[PDB]
Design a protein around this ligand. Structure first.
Ligand code: NA
Ligand code: NA
Lengths: 228, 226
């Protein structure tokens, strides 16, 4: 990725170095009074929150390159009691205090625009997810998630669109969800063949995740067209 | 709101004047190739999506002051085929072509942050709403909507906290079943054209993460009833 590589060299040009994290580690946590801007450069993370009793609810998944803020740019206070957990075996991230990010995005605009449009992609993503859910319930939500996994890690092969993602991460990606996923398998929308998973009915996923499909077309058109 | 007013002048000083809309008008629409940055200064709007067949999906409700953008600030292309419909009787919005916003946001860090910050409020709003719904179904959802409505339009009366909003405006905000259940549980009561919330702690208990979001995003108004 190009627009994200420039942001990386903008951070390093100002002295910020990368840190390596590993599975189950938290890049930021819900109890820290200091808030940060996380430029996730490589790896897969998930935003999590603990309810009143102790149930860990998964809120959102991110893969580098991306920008996750734990605090408001202006107030520097928390946007929510959230933790950013690594779910890939390793992850590389730049950790900037919200204190200092505001000053760095002022000295430049191409890189403010970069962080600014990631927020926009998040905003529209959630609205599209909400729209698909309101129409097809969780089926649309699960088709949508599999749709973006297909567009991101998918590559066409004779057996269909092969999801080129180690299963140790895909299994990370409860009962209501497991039933839907394997009903798609029973319907041969997605199939297992020789240690790999292939999407064999792409149009099915598009049918029940239309607004997430449109979101990806609008947000990542070049990657959308590969499989369209 | 302090920061909303400082942004208002910045647009006026630079030569963008407010435009008045009335109920049912679309400040922007999903078939328009020109994308805009809308600072809705006053009034209540709703973000919709219209499919080929014509159903109007209601995606989000905004109240001024807020900022809604229909295009990406860098590519200027659509972020989604949406409309911003006015649901109150009147509304006042500053309509800026997205190309022109880049100039204004380029020359100020304070006003850039204001819009940046409101996008963050939206991201965390959606996660909180998602968290509440995955733990308490639609009950927590409507409790959340009623909660923030009570927070913004709350006015104490002898018969509970009055939701000081127009009946036609709240008419525009399954669901009915939940509302009836709420009525039969000593929570919400309807009479004389408005709703009254008598047990506000009930709503906080089933909309905890959106109560947290309101606590974290809108403290001054959160402290009204806390
Ligand atoms: Na934190
Ligand atoms: Na439009």
């Amino acid at each position: 990725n190009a627009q994200a590589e420039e942001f990386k060299k903008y951070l390093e040009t100002n002295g910020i170095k990368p840190k390596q994290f590993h599975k189950k580690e938290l890049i930021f946590n819900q109890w820290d009074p200091q808030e940060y801007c996380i430029f996730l450069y490589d790896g897969i993370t998930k935003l999590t929150s603990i309810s009143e009793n102790g149930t860990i609810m998964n809120l959102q998944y991110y893969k580098g390159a991306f920008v996750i803020m734990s605090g408001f740019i202006d107030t520097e206070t928390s946007v929510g009691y959230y933790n950013l957990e690594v779910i890939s075996e390793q992850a590389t991230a730049y950790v900037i205090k919200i204190n200092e990010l505001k000053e760095l995005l002022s000295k430049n605009l191409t890189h403010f625009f970069y962080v600014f449009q990631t927020l926009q992609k998040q905003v529209s993503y959630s609205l599209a997810k909400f729209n698909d859910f309101s129409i097809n319930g969780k089926l649309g939500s699960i088709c949508g998630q599999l749709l973006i996994l297909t567009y991101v890690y998918g590559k066409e092969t004779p057996d269909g669109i092969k999801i080129t993602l180690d299963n140790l991460t895909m299994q990370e990606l409860s009962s209501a969800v497991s039933r839907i996923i394997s009903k798609l398998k029973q319907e041969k929308v997605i199939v297992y063949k020789n240690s790999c998973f292939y999407v064999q009915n792409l149009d099915y996923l598009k049918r029940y995740a239309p607004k997430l499909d449109e979101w990806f077309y609008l947000a990542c058109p070049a990657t959308w067209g590969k499989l369209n």
